[PDB]
Amino acid sequence: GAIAGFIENGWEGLIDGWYGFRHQNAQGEGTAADYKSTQSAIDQITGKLNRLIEKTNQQFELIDNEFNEVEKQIGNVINWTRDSITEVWSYNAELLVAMENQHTIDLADSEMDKLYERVKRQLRENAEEDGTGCFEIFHKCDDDCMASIRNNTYDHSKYREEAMQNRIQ
Amino acid sequence: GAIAGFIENGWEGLIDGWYGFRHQNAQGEGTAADYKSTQSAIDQITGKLNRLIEKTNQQFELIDNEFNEVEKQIGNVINWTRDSITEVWSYNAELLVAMENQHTIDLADSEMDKLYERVKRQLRENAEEDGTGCFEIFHKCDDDCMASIRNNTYDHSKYREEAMQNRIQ
Amino acid sequence: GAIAGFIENGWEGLIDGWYGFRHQNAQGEGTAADYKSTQSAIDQITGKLNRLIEKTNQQFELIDNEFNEVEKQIGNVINWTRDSITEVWSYNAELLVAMENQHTIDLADSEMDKLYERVKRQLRENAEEDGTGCFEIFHKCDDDCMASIRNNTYDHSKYREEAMQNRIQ
Amino acid sequence: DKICLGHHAVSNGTKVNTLTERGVEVVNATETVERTNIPRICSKGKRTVDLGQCGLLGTITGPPQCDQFLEFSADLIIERREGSDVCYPGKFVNEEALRQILRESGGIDKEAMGFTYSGIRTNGATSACRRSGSSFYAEMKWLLSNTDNAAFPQMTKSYKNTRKSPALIVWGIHHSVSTAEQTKLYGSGNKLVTVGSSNYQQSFVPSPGARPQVNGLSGRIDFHWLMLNPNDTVTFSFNGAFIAPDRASFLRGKSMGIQSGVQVDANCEGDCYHSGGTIISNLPFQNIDSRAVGKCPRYVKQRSLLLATGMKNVPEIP
Amino acid sequence: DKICLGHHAVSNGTKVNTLTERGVEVVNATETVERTNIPRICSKGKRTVDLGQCGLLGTITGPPQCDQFLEFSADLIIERREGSDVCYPGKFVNEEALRQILRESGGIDKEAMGFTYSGIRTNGATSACRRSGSSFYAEMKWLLSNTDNAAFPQMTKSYKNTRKSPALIVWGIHHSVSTAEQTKLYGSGNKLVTVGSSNYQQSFVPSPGARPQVNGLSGRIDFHWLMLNPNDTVTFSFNGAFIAPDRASFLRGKSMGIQSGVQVDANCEGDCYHSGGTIISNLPFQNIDSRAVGKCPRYVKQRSLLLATGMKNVPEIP
Amino acid sequence: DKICLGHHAVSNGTKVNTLTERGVEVVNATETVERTNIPRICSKGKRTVDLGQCGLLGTITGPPQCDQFLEFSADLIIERREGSDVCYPGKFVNEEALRQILRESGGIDKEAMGFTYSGIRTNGATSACRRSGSSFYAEMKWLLSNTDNAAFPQMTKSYKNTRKSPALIVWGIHHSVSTAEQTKLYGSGNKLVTVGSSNYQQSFVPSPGARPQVNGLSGRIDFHWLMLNPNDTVTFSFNGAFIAPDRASFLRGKSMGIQSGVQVDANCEGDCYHSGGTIISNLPFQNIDSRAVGKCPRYVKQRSLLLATGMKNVPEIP
Ligand SMILES: *[C@@H]1O[C@H](CO)[C@@H](O[C@@H]2O[C@H](CO)[C@@H](O)[C@H](O)[C@H]2NC(C)=O)[C@H](O)[C@H]1NC(C)=O
Ligand SMILES: *[C@@H]1O[C@H](CO)[C@@H](O[C@@H]2O[C@H](CO)[C@@H](O)[C@H](O)[C@H]2NC(C)=O)[C@H](O)[C@H]1NC(C)=O
Ligand SMILES: *[C@@H]1O[C@H](CO)[C@@H](O[C@@H]2O[C@H](CO)[C@@H](O)[C@H](O)[C@H]2NC(C)=O)[C@H](O)[C@H]1NC(C)=O
Ligand SMILES: *[C@@H]1O[C@H](CO)[C@@H](O)[C@H](O)[C@H]1NC(C)=O
Ligand SMILES: *[C@@H]1O[C@H](CO)[C@@H](O)[C@H](O)[C@H]1NC(C)=O
Ligand SMILES: *[C@@H]1O[C@H](CO)[C@@H](O)[C@H](O)[C@H]1NC(C)=O
Ligand SMILES: *[C@@H]1O[C@H](CO)[C@@H](O)[C@H](O)[C@H]1NC(C)=O
Ligand SMILES: *[C@@H]1O[C@H](CO)[C@@H](O)[C@H](O)[C@H]1NC(C)=O
Ligand SMILES: *[C@@H]1O[C@H](CO)[C@@H](O)[C@H](O)[C@H]1NC(C)=O
């Protein structure tokens, strides 16, 4: 009946945010979403979307005719040019999406690390990493204590004696 | 009258480098720039610049006429081709700069982390992170000691007894 | 006669993998490759290769003539178009390779960090970083113990008493 | 006591592509390539003319089919496959360049050129241009000799464009089924037509001869055109086989022309068209038609390119 | 006791480029720009014809050089520099458009047009078309008057395309060295040739005059062509100087044409060609020939663009 | 005791764009799109000719305006709007192709073609080509009959290019204001001009008729040209209305031509030009002129694209 974080597995129950907290104490188990990390990720992704919506003001008109076919030579030159330009945009499109997708995935992984590292810095010397994206807290951390960690009001000075004791023996 | 590092805020006073150190001891406060990290960043950015200076040897000549307008059909084909090519370069330009700028920013953030992680490894078990990009040093670190950290001549073995004592109680 | 890891220097002797372990204990020195990290990197690089092999189904035919030169005006329009398209692909090619190479290098550096961080999390409080990509292990770690670290079967609980003792004094 | 950091995930994962992987699952994605076509011409906000059976070039010469469009005005011009520029069999020289010009003209303003004739018939008509009875191109005059086989007098007519825009001028050369018929209409001897401007010089000789019957007729009228610069003058020198203009055309402003085979809709608002309808999309690319015109997303070969709008999907350990 | 994490490295490092560095060493790299050319035309799997001395347009008219190819069939068509479309000096009007059409025709099927003549010679021949003795274009008839200086009767010949594909029709106008020679062949007076279709109308007058001797001859025959739509008819009206067609051509299917100066190989299998041979490569780009045709990697200016297939190379500390 | 790691920052931050953000502040940035134009033609190092009132095609035929440039030599050629190719009203056939050829010719070398005439006048002149008095094109001969209305003898003139470069050959057809004037100059009857090469065959008939007065004249001379291959010969057959060449032209080497309306500067050194001046820049892109020629940065729509040359700017906490 253990809990685990990122590093082999996401949470299909975290449905009110992208990144979040999951704790277990004497009060039981709980899960809440972190706003700042989730909003950062959403802002960057929507930022990408808007950038790809920026419409072009270039207008193009007919250069050939599909009722009365144009002269062969100029028609083949036109087709060769269009197909060449289509290859170029097809390539550009493919590369753009692949590139953006790689970046979307990476910055998302980045946000997860920044959140984890932040929490690690809050807990100071009162906790140890379990290796599954979690922190074993070496003192009593009730729901109020767990909430203090989530909103960065956790003062490690308060639990340091109790925690360092339990860590050393 | 506290000092803080990267993580919410840069230093508008660090004017002789990109990355640097800021300390406070009994001798007071000081700020110095780190050469290696700053030079790495500058070398990579200038490297980008030179890459974008690499001139083309392709020469282009007039294909139409702005005094005596060419024939309509071939003229419209030419305009349609040029405008198509302009859309392509306009896109390429936009994407290149956006891509390069994202990378410039990220590698810069990377250098900051590498510097921070290096210092963390120098100090070993004689310090703790305060969560603002700083290290609380659990021993006496005068200006000479602070300078030893900046040039990687800091031997943690020398202060380890004194430091571990102050950390544990 | 010391050993060192990544951070100033690779290993020209690691010839059965990309990422690996190097230890020294009473039994002596040894080097072995890590499969999972090496295979991840190889899968991503070959993934790039296949993506660049995806052939085009667009067929192009002759639009001019190198035995009987076409008419001057349409010929110059054709040459101007082709050279324009060549500039575009030459640019695309240059940018693609430069971009991919930057990413190949970075994801490779990433895999190295993920491996290092994993090992760090295995060893918990029984080790310290030496600052050269290595871990000083504060307990007896024979070949069997070293092998347990490589296949993630290392239980830090078993050596914690012995290790924390040696770390503190 | 324990606190874990995590991220959301689903079983409803959708595959995308990256630089490295092909089919890597992400939590959410959206399409970048438009494939959804509206099989209508969305014309709301645009003054639209559906030429129907009238060919676009016919608006200048004026066969019966184009009587409604002789001075038409539009923001959006639609050619139809059933359209025809012609009643009496023939075609334009440099037709497509002329079409491209009219598609963005905004319509045409006609103005009389004021040609007067003597010792000559002007009532040349045909069964192929039925307008109540036999007739001819509305903007043109089919000139004959006077009686039959009678000599056609050498003539010279000029016209100055006194406006500030270029004038579209059109004339026709008539090719009889036989030299016997050419003689019956314009008299014996060789026939010459010269057209002079201040930036244009051309010449024309008729070519009598048997041709396949089109609309029951084996004769051909091929039309020619030039743009007359402001204050410049065109001069017509001829002695037969000449189809004279009655009015010149002036371009109204700005428009866009398309070729389509679907209905018009004045309710929908669009800006990117193809023969099959309107593409309305904020997406950067489309896979509907490469020859689409207006303000459009760029055409691509692929039918789908999914853009990740969420993080990589990692299923929870059960 | 100590455990270190590391990565492999070599002394055999190869330099590549990135966004930032130029010449950064990586452990392993591969080329993306093909430069390796196979100096043959790899034709395995493809039905290939090497026209050799036969010019491609000659397959339609039929000089002696093209007698083998009058109804040829191919997947791959190869023009050669020594090729010639002509025996009696001359050239095609709109030659290149016609070549481009034949390169992807899949070869040609010839069919008799069934023209019959009276009061006229049809055995026009020349020393320039030696086939055993003096002869002419195999698919064409050189029409004369009957005796010498005798009048050439006005004639009219028509032909309907009763098939489902367009017919390629070709005719020639003969330009004599002098009006004296033109008269000797076709009689006195002006000469006119008219060609009428249901989408085509053209006219032709011969131009007698001295020209440089080519193949010993100062006369020129210039060829003209049109595509005849199904069920449509062409009509020829003429009174001399007319080189009549005997058969029409029909395109067989699909093919590709190239111009080359290297041998053919039916063992190698290829799909991208240039005048210097075949490019077989999985690489995305090539630096061999910009005008290469078929299914090819994109041409680039650079001869080499190395793609890193390994991590950054960091030498071990000795 | 405490040590902090940090990075520099400013209040002077400049906004740029990335994949994600729009207007993210960085410490320092630079422009990639050139907008700074030098309103001169920087010609230092380049042999430059400013044709001025001489039209480029005029350098071949030789109206008074081009007398200085009949054998000009240049690295950089500049056409001006006031330039004219013509004294006696007319134009070239395929003019633009010829201009494009001369723009990169490096200038022209003229050589006599050595035509001799008998029973004919060669001193055709006009008021429109005033050179001291009435004159004509310097490189051309206006041929007449001999007295007035007198018959023009049929003539044939040939010229072989004995050099290793192609020869530029030019001739003119004269179109009289009336058949009466044509007869007065060249005699009665139809007039024919034939031009034969070994890769070229064309024919020409004059077109007398009234045209608008240009330079006070209603006649037109339209010029024609061909390139003559080495050791090949051109032959001219004519009987009137023929404007004969006196010299042929040979291209000197290599050059570049531009059209401009700004002054020349031999102090500044440039390599990218447009009608408004010179673009000197190491920047990859420019937003000055899409039709700019030479060695240029690529033209783009945007006026500014800022490249970050520094890290993200994060203001210090006060
Ligand atoms: C999956 O991605 C789509 C695309 O971004 C999201 O749908 C968007 O939702 C926002 C707000 O609801 C709208 O402004 C966009 O117009 C929508 N786009 C499309 C294409 O419909 C969707 O919200 C995402 N899924 C979840 C669960 O957030
Ligand atoms: C260096 O890179 C090349 C290119 O990827 C590797 O050669 C490939 O090897 C695999 C399997 O042996 C083949 O499927 C590919 O076709 C090879 N490519 C080429 C271009 O030959 C090579 O293995 C790499 N070097 C090392 C030591 O792994
Ligand atoms: C801001 O960026 C510009 C552009 O890189 C820097 O200006 C460059 O300075 C170097 C050396 O002084 C010159 O070689 C470049 O030619 C300059 N570029 C331009 C466009 O002028 C500038 O130094 C940067 N600002 C700071 C404070 O370093
Ligand atoms: C141009 O491409 C279209 C689409 O395949 C084709 O129908 C048309 O025939 C081509 N044009 C010419 C001149 O062949
Ligand atoms: C090509 O574009 C220019 C610039 O707008 C325009 O002035 C010119 O008329 C166009 N060409 C034709 C043939 O319309
Ligand atoms: C097109 O480019 C080729 C290659 O340089 C050249 O030989 C040819 O002359 C060019 N075409 C024209 C019409 O100049
Ligand atoms: C208009 O044309 C007349 C002759 O037709 C000419 O004299 C005049 O210069 C032209 N321009 C103006 C502005 O009148
Ligand atoms: C074929 O041609 C004939 C006359 O040549 C015409 O009447 C008929 O409509 C055409 N089409 C068909 C399908 O018969
Ligand atoms: C040059 O021309 C002559 C005839 O004008 C011809 O016999 C000869 O073959 C040509 N070539 C050379 C190299 O003499």
Coordinates of N, CA, C and O in Angstrom, one line a residue, chain D residues 70-155:
Chain D
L70 N -22.0 43.0 -68.6 CA -21.2 43.9 -69.4 C -20.5 45.0 -68.7 O -19.5 45.5 -69.2
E71 N -21.1 45.3 -67.5 CA -20.4 46.4 -66.7 C -20.5 45.9 -65.2 O -20.9 46.7 -64.3
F72 N -20.3 44.6 -65.0 CA -20.4 44.0 -63.7 C -19.4 44.6 -62.6 O -18.4 45.1 -63.0
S73 N -19.8 44.4 -61.4 CA -18.9 44.9 -60.3 C -18.9 43.8 -59.2 O -19.9 43.2 -58.9
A74 N -17.7 43.5 -58.7 CA -17.6 42.4 -57.8 C -16.3 42.5 -56.9 O -15.4 43.1 -57.2
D75 N -16.4 41.8 -55.7 CA -15.3 41.6 -54.9 C -14.8 40.2 -55.1 O -13.6 39.9 -55.1
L76 N -15.7 39.3 -55.4 CA -15.4 37.9 -55.7 C -16.1 37.5 -57.0 O -17.3 37.6 -57.2
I77 N -15.2 36.9 -57.9 CA -15.7 36.5 -59.2 C -15.6 35.0 -59.4 O -14.5 34.5 -59.1
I78 N -16.6 34.4 -59.8 CA -16.6 32.9 -59.9 C -16.9 32.5 -61.4 O -18.0 32.6 -61.9
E79 N -15.9 31.8 -61.9 CA -16.0 31.2 -63.2 C -16.6 29.8 -63.1 O -16.4 29.1 -62.1
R80 N -17.4 29.4 -64.0 CA -18.0 28.1 -64.0 C -17.6 27.3 -65.3 O -17.3 27.8 -66.3
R81 N -17.5 25.9 -65.1 CA -17.1 25.1 -66.2 C -17.9 25.2 -67.5 O -17.4 25.2 -68.6
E82 N -19.2 25.4 -67.3 CA -20.2 25.6 -68.4 C -20.0 27.0 -69.1 O -20.6 27.2 -70.1
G83 N -19.3 27.8 -68.4 CA -19.0 29.2 -69.0 C -18.4 29.1 -70.4 O -17.6 28.2 -70.7
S84 N -18.8 30.1 -71.2 CA -18.2 30.2 -72.5 C -18.0 31.7 -72.9 O -18.9 32.5 -72.6
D85 N -16.8 32.0 -73.4 CA -16.5 33.4 -73.8 C -17.0 33.7 -75.2 O -16.9 34.9 -75.6
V86 N -17.7 32.8 -75.8 CA -17.9 32.9 -77.2 C -19.3 32.5 -77.7 O -20.0 31.6 -77.0
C87 N -19.9 33.1 -78.7 CA -21.1 32.6 -79.4 C -20.7 32.1 -80.8 O -20.7 31.0 -81.0
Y88 N -20.2 33.1 -81.6 CA -19.5 32.7 -82.8 C -18.1 32.1 -82.5 O -17.3 32.7 -81.9
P89 N -17.9 30.8 -83.0 CA -16.7 30.1 -82.6 C -15.4 30.8 -82.8 O -15.1 31.5 -83.8
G90 N -14.6 30.7 -81.8 CA -13.3 31.4 -81.7 C -12.7 31.4 -80.4 O -13.2 30.7 -79.4
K91 N -11.6 32.1 -80.2 CA -10.9 32.2 -78.9 C -10.0 33.4 -78.8 O -9.8 34.1 -79.9
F92 N -9.6 33.8 -77.6 CA -8.7 34.9 -77.5 C -7.2 34.5 -77.6 O -6.9 33.4 -77.3
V93 N -6.4 35.4 -78.1 CA -5.0 35.3 -78.1 C -4.6 35.8 -76.7 O -5.1 36.8 -76.2
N94 N -3.6 35.1 -76.1 CA -3.2 35.4 -74.7 C -4.4 35.4 -73.8 O -4.5 36.4 -73.0
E95 N -5.2 34.4 -73.8 CA -6.4 34.4 -73.1 C -6.2 34.4 -71.6 O -6.9 35.1 -70.8
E96 N -5.3 33.5 -71.1 CA -5.1 33.3 -69.7 C -4.6 34.6 -68.9 O -5.0 34.9 -67.8
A97 N -3.7 35.3 -69.6 CA -3.2 36.5 -69.0 C -4.3 37.5 -68.9 O -4.4 38.3 -67.9
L98 N -5.2 37.5 -69.8 CA -6.4 38.4 -69.8 C -7.4 38.0 -68.7 O -8.0 38.8 -68.0
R99 N -7.5 36.7 -68.5 CA -8.4 36.2 -67.4 C -7.9 36.6 -66.1 O -8.6 37.1 -65.2
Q100 N -6.6 36.5 -65.9 CA -5.9 36.8 -64.6 C -6.1 38.3 -64.3 O -6.2 38.7 -63.2
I101 N -6.1 39.1 -65.4 CA -6.3 40.6 -65.2 C -7.7 40.9 -64.7 O -7.9 41.6 -63.8
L102 N -8.7 40.2 -65.4 CA -10.1 40.5 -65.1 C -10.5 39.9 -63.7 O -11.4 40.4 -63.1
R103 N -9.8 38.8 -63.2 CA -10.2 38.2 -62.0 C -9.9 39.2 -60.8 O -10.6 39.1 -59.8
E104 N -9.0 40.1 -61.0 CA -8.7 41.1 -59.9 C -9.1 42.5 -60.3 O -8.6 43.5 -59.8
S105 N -10.0 42.7 -61.3 CA -10.3 44.0 -61.8 C -11.4 44.7 -60.9 O -11.4 45.9 -60.9
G106 N -12.2 43.9 -60.2 CA -13.3 44.5 -59.5 C -14.5 44.7 -60.4 O -15.4 45.4 -60.0
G107 N -14.4 44.1 -61.6 CA -15.5 44.4 -62.6 C -15.0 45.4 -63.6 O -13.9 45.8 -63.6
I108 N -15.9 45.7 -64.5 CA -15.5 46.5 -65.7 C -16.5 47.7 -65.9 O -17.7 47.6 -65.7
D109 N -15.9 48.8 -66.3 CA -16.7 50.0 -66.7 C -16.5 50.1 -68.2 O -15.4 50.2 -68.7
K110 N -17.6 50.1 -68.9 CA -17.6 50.2 -70.4 C -17.8 51.7 -70.8 O -18.5 52.4 -70.2
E111 N -17.1 52.1 -71.9 CA -17.2 53.4 -72.4 C -17.1 53.4 -73.9 O -16.2 52.7 -74.5
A112 N -18.0 54.1 -74.6 CA -18.0 54.1 -76.0 C -16.7 54.7 -76.6 O -16.1 55.6 -76.0
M113 N -16.3 54.1 -77.7 CA -15.1 54.5 -78.4 C -15.4 55.5 -79.5 O -14.5 56.2 -80.0
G114 N -16.6 55.5 -80.0 CA -17.1 56.5 -80.9 C -16.6 56.4 -82.3 O -16.1 57.3 -82.9
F115 N -16.6 55.1 -82.8 CA -16.2 54.9 -84.2 C -17.4 55.1 -85.1 O -18.5 54.7 -84.8
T116 N -17.2 55.8 -86.2 CA -18.3 56.0 -87.2 C -17.8 55.5 -88.6 O -16.7 55.5 -88.9
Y117 N -18.8 55.0 -89.3 CA -18.5 54.3 -90.6 C -19.3 54.8 -91.8 O -20.5 55.2 -91.6
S118 N -18.8 54.7 -93.0 CA -19.5 55.1 -94.2 C -19.1 54.2 -95.4 O -18.0 53.8 -95.5
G119 N -20.1 53.8 -96.2 CA -19.8 53.0 -97.4 C -19.5 51.6 -97.0 O -18.7 50.9 -97.6
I120 N -20.3 51.1 -96.1 CA -20.0 49.8 -95.3 C -21.2 49.4 -94.5 O -22.0 50.2 -94.1
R121 N -21.4 48.1 -94.4 CA -22.4 47.6 -93.4 C -21.7 47.3 -92.1 O -20.6 47.0 -92.0
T122 N -22.5 47.5 -91.0 CA -22.0 47.2 -89.7 C -22.9 46.2 -89.0 O -22.7 45.8 -87.8
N123 N -23.9 45.7 -89.7 CA -24.9 44.8 -89.0 C -24.6 43.3 -89.2 O -25.5 42.5 -89.3
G124 N -23.3 43.0 -89.2 CA -22.9 41.6 -89.3 C -23.5 40.8 -88.1 O -23.3 41.2 -87.0
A125 N -24.2 39.8 -88.5 CA -24.9 39.0 -87.4 C -24.8 37.5 -87.7 O -24.3 37.1 -88.8
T126 N -25.1 36.7 -86.8 CA -25.1 35.2 -87.0 C -26.1 34.5 -86.2 O -26.6 35.0 -85.2
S127 N -26.4 33.3 -86.6 CA -27.4 32.4 -85.9 C -26.8 31.9 -84.6 O -27.5 31.4 -83.7
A128 N -25.5 32.0 -84.5 CA -24.8 31.4 -83.3 C -24.9 32.4 -82.1 O -24.8 32.0 -81.0
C129 N -25.2 33.6 -82.4 CA -25.5 34.6 -81.4 C -26.9 35.0 -81.3 O -27.3 36.2 -81.6
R130 N -27.8 34.0 -81.1 CA -29.2 34.3 -81.1 C -29.6 35.1 -79.9 O -29.3 34.8 -78.7
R131 N -30.1 36.3 -80.1 CA -30.7 37.2 -79.2 C -32.0 37.7 -79.8 O -32.0 38.5 -80.6
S132 N -33.1 37.1 -79.3 CA -34.4 37.1 -80.0 C -34.2 36.5 -81.4 O -34.6 35.4 -81.6
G133 N -33.6 37.2 -82.3 CA -33.2 36.7 -83.6 C -31.7 36.5 -83.8 O -31.0 36.5 -82.8
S134 N -31.2 36.4 -85.0 CA -29.7 36.4 -85.2 C -29.2 37.8 -84.8 O -29.8 38.8 -85.0
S135 N -28.0 37.7 -84.2 CA -27.3 38.9 -83.7 C -25.8 38.7 -83.7 O -25.3 37.8 -84.4
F136 N -25.1 39.4 -82.8 CA -23.7 39.4 -82.8 C -23.2 39.7 -81.4 O -24.0 39.9 -80.5
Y137 N -21.9 39.8 -81.2 CA -21.3 40.3 -79.9 C -21.8 41.7 -79.6 O -21.7 42.6 -80.5
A138 N -22.3 41.9 -78.4 CA -22.9 43.2 -78.0 C -21.9 44.4 -78.1 O -22.4 45.5 -78.3
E139 N -20.7 44.2 -77.8 CA -19.7 45.3 -77.7 C -18.9 45.4 -79.0 O -18.0 46.3 -79.1
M140 N -19.2 44.6 -80.0 CA -18.4 44.5 -81.2 C -19.3 44.8 -82.4 O -20.5 44.7 -82.4
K141 N -18.7 45.2 -83.5 CA -19.4 45.5 -84.8 C -18.7 44.6 -85.8 O -17.5 44.7 -86.1
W142 N -19.5 43.7 -86.5 CA -19.1 42.9 -87.6 C -19.2 43.7 -88.9 O -20.4 43.9 -89.3
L143 N -18.1 44.2 -89.4 CA -18.1 45.0 -90.6 C -18.1 44.3 -91.9 O -17.3 43.3 -92.0
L144 N -18.9 44.6 -92.8 CA -18.9 44.0 -94.2 C -18.7 45.1 -95.2 O -18.4 46.2 -95.0
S145 N -18.8 44.7 -96.5 CA -18.5 45.6 -97.6 C -19.7 46.5 -97.9 O -19.5 47.7 -97.6
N146 N -20.8 46.0 -98.4 CA -22.0 46.8 -98.6 C -23.1 46.1 -99.3 O -24.3 46.2 -98.9
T147 N -22.8 45.3 -100.3 CA -23.7 44.6 -101.1 C -23.4 43.1 -101.1 O -24.2 42.3 -100.6
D148 N -22.3 42.7 -101.7 CA -21.8 41.3 -101.8 C -20.7 41.3 -102.8 O -20.8 41.9 -103.9
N149 N -19.5 40.8 -102.4 CA -18.3 40.8 -103.2 C -17.8 42.2 -103.5 O -16.8 42.3 -104.2
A150 N -18.5 43.2 -103.0 CA -18.1 44.6 -103.2 C -16.8 44.9 -102.5 O -16.5 44.3 -101.5
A151 N -16.1 45.9 -103.0 CA -14.8 46.2 -102.4 C -15.0 46.9 -101.0 O -15.8 47.7 -100.8
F152 N -14.2 46.4 -100.0 CA -14.2 47.1 -98.7 C -13.2 48.2 -98.7 O -12.0 48.0 -99.0
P153 N -13.6 49.4 -98.4 CA -12.8 50.6 -98.4 C -11.7 50.5 -97.3 O -12.0 50.0 -96.2
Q154 N -10.5 51.0 -97.6 CA -9.5 51.1 -96.6 C -9.9 52.1 -95.6 O -10.4 53.2 -95.9
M155 N -9.8 51.7 -94.3 CA -10.3 52.6 -93.2 C -9.2 52.8 -92.1 O -8.4 51.9 -91.9

